[PDB]
C-alpha cells in the first residue's frame, strides 16, 4: 500500500485554488499541489496575497 | 441460554511509548496501573 | 531511509519517516532548495516526536524557498565541530566552516 | 443485489482498516482524476461494474468530513439490502421492530454489546448464536459487524426507523393500559 | 446496580452508570481501595452531570493508590452526622466519626 501512496504523492493544466475563509484581511486557500513559501498570489479582483503560513 | 451464552463467551503486561519529549512521556494500554 | 516534508511554518519544519527507521534526538538532517536564485542546503536538528512516525525539527538557516515533497537524509550523529592545536588564529561561523580561508580544515 | 451488498461490506471494511486512505480521500478539491486513478490502481478488478461506478461517483463528490465518506457506503449497502428484501414488507418490519425491542429489554446482553478491541468476527458469532427472517438476520449481522464504539440499541432503533421511513408511513408511539380491540385500533389509525 | 470509573485526575473522579440508575445531586457514594498497606474506603459526593450516564464528583479522602475498573456503590442518601445531648464533651471530624472513642456515638 506504500507504493500507491508514493505514486499518489509523485504524480503531481494550471493549478487553481478556492477561497474558504475571509474577514479582517486573512484568507485560507487550498488545492495548490505546487506550493511556495512567500509567493505572490494573484486574486481575481486584482489584489495580491502573500503566503505567511503552510 | 443468554446467561449460558455469556458464560461461554467468557472463555503478561507490556506497554508502548506513543510519544515522548521535554522530559515527559505518554503510554498506552497497561490497564493494571 | 528517505523522508518527506509534510508541514512547514516559520523556522519550524515537520517531517515524516518510514515506519522502519526513525532517527533519535539531536540528529542532523540534510535538505536542499531547488530554486535557481536562492539555491542552498539546510541542516535540521531533531526536537521532538509527535507519533505516527512524525518528527519536529528546527531549521539552521532561513527557511525561505522550501517546498513540499523534498527528500530528507540523515547522518545518525549529533552536530560535530573541529578541534585541534592549530585552530587558534582564525574566524569561525556557527557551523564551524572557516571564513577568512574557505575550505580550510576537515582534517582535525 | 446480495453480491453487491457483500462487495460494499468488503470495501467498507477495508477502508475502515486503514486510516491514511480516509485522510487523503477527504481532501476538498474540485478535480477527481487522481482519485479515480488511485481507485483503478487499488484493486479495481475485485468488484462488479455497477458497484465500481457507484464507488467512483461517491469518491468523486466532495465530502465535508471523512466520517460522511465512511458512513455513505454503509448506508448505501443497507438501503440496497432493504430494496432487495422488498422485491412481505409489513411482516419484516414487525419482526425487526419486535426483535430489537425484546433484545434491548434484556440489560445483560446490552452490557455485553460493547465492542472495542474485541475479535473482528468472534463477537459476530457469539451474538448470532445468542439470538427468523433471512433479510432481518442478514441486516442484523451487517449492523453488528460495522459498529465502532456506538450504542447498539440506538443502532437497531435507527435501522427500524429508516426501514419504516422508506415506505410512506410515519411511526408513532402509543401507550395504553391494555391492548384495544382490532376494530377500535383500525378506527384509531383512520383518525 | 453499580457503575465504573473511566477517568481519574487530582481529587475529582468521574463515574459511569447504566440506564435508569443515575443519582440526583449531592448523594454519597462509596468506593473500595485495596493494597498491601493502604486500605481505606473512599467517600465521594456528586458534583455535576456530564450526560451520557456519566457523573463527575469529588472525594473526601486522598485518591492515592486507586486503580481503574473498581466498582462504585451508591447509598441513595446525603451526608449525615449524629446529633443529641451526648455530643457534648467530644471531638469529631467532618464525617462525624468520634475521634476520642472510635465506637462512640453511632446510635443517635
Swiss-Prot record, chain A:
The chain holds residues 11 to 69 of 548 of the full protein. It is found in: Cell membrane. Produces ATP from ADP in the presence of a proton gradient across the membrane. The alpha chain is a regulatory subunit. This is ATP synthase subunit alpha. Disulfide bonds: none annotated. The gene is atpA. Belongs to the ATPase alpha/beta chains family. Signal peptide: none annotated. F-type ATPases have 2 components, CF(1) - the catalytic core - and CF(0) - the membrane proton channel. CF(1) has five subunits: alpha(3), beta(3), gamma(1), delta(1), epsilon(1). CF(0) has three main subunits: a(1), b(2) and c(9-12). The alpha and beta chains form an alternating ring which encloses part of the gamma chain. CF(1) is attached to CF(0) by a central stalk formed by the gamma and epsilon chains, while a peripheral stalk is formed by the delta and b chains. It comes from the Bacteria.
Swiss-Prot record, chains C, E:
Disulfide bonds: none annotated. It comes from the Bacteria. It is found in: Cell membrane. Produces ATP from ADP in the presence of a proton gradient across the membrane. The catalytic sites are hosted primarily by the beta subunits. F-type ATPases have 2 components, CF(1) - the catalytic core - and CF(0) - the membrane proton channel. CF(1) has five subunits: alpha(3), beta(3), gamma(1), delta(1), epsilon(1). CF(0) has three main subunits: a(1), b(2) and c(9-12). The alpha and beta chains form an alternating ring which encloses part of the gamma chain. CF(1) is attached to CF(0) by a central stalk formed by the gamma and epsilon chains, while a peripheral stalk is formed by the delta and b chains. Belongs to the ATPase alpha/beta chains family. This is ATP synthase subunit beta. The gene is atpD.
Swiss-Prot record, chain D:
F-type ATPases have 2 components, F(1) - the catalytic core - and F(0) - the membrane proton channel. F(1) has five subunits: alpha(3), beta(3), gamma(1), delta(1), epsilon(1). F(0) has three main subunits: a(1), b(2) and c(10-14). The alpha and beta chains form an alternating ring which encloses part of the gamma chain. F(1) is attached to F(0) by a central stalk formed by the gamma and epsilon chains, while a peripheral stalk is formed by the delta and b chains. In the N-terminal section; belongs to the ATPase B chain family. In the C-terminal section; belongs to the ATPase delta chain family. The gene is atpFH. It is found in: Cell membrane. Binds 2-aminothiazole antibiotics, which are antitubercular agents. Residues 1-191 are annotated as: ATP synthase subunit delta. This is ATP synthase subunit b-delta. F(1)F(0) ATP synthase produces ATP from ADP in the presence of a proton or sodium gradient. F-type ATPases consist of two structural domains, F(1) containing the extramembraneous catalytic core and F(0) containing the membrane proton channel, linked together by a central stalk and a peripheral stalk. During catalysis, ATP synthesis in the catalytic domain of F(1) is coupled via a rotary mechanism of the central stalk subunits to proton translocation. This fusion protein includes a component of the F(0) channel (subunit b) and of the F(1) subunit (subunit delta). Two copies of subunit b and one of delta together form the peripheral 'stator' stalk which links F(1) to F(0).
